[PDB]
Amino acid sequence: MFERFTDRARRVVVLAQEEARMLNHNYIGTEHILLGLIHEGEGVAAKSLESLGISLEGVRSQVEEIIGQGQQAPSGHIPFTPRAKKVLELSLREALQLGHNYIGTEHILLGLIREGEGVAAQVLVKLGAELTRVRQQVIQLLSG
């Protein structure tokens, strides 16, 4: 379902799966997508998150605190959570409603906030970033 994803939006997902692999996690969840948005660095999502004071180490530290330690020999298959798949689907639906034929980093962050009830949304409101503020930051940076 990544047909209209931009090269940097594709990069976001790649970094997400590499974070889940490094952190010894069994799924690619919404919080790994959030980490990938920050890791990408250059897109509208990364700039928006930086203007809100959301750092890579703060999200990663909050994620390890919630999930905890895993197995010594986990299964090598790391699929998306159903919640992360819904975020990706809502990313497409957000960009379609805006009249865009592409899906960039800003649409993935918007879709993440739209779902707004997983690990990523939980880590965001813990780091002092209410979800409605993240959306307005993304929208106001897309205006100019």
Partner 1 sequence: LVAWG
How far is residue 78's CA from residue 95's CA, in Å, rounded to a whole number?
A: 27
Does 35 bind partner 1 (CB under 8 A)? Our answer is no
Q: From partner 1, a second copy, none, which one binds at residue 1 (CB under 5 to 8 Å depending on kind)?
A: a second copy
- Give the shortest CB-68-to-partner 1 separation in angstroms: 24
Residue pair 134/109 in contact by the 8 Å Cβ criterion: yes
- Give the shortest CB-31-to-partner 1 separation in angstroms: 17
Residue 144's contacts (CB-CB under 8 Å, 6 or more residues apart) are none
Residues that bind partner 1 (CB under 8 A): 2-5, 10, 13-14, 17, 77-79, 85-86, 88-89, 91-92, 103
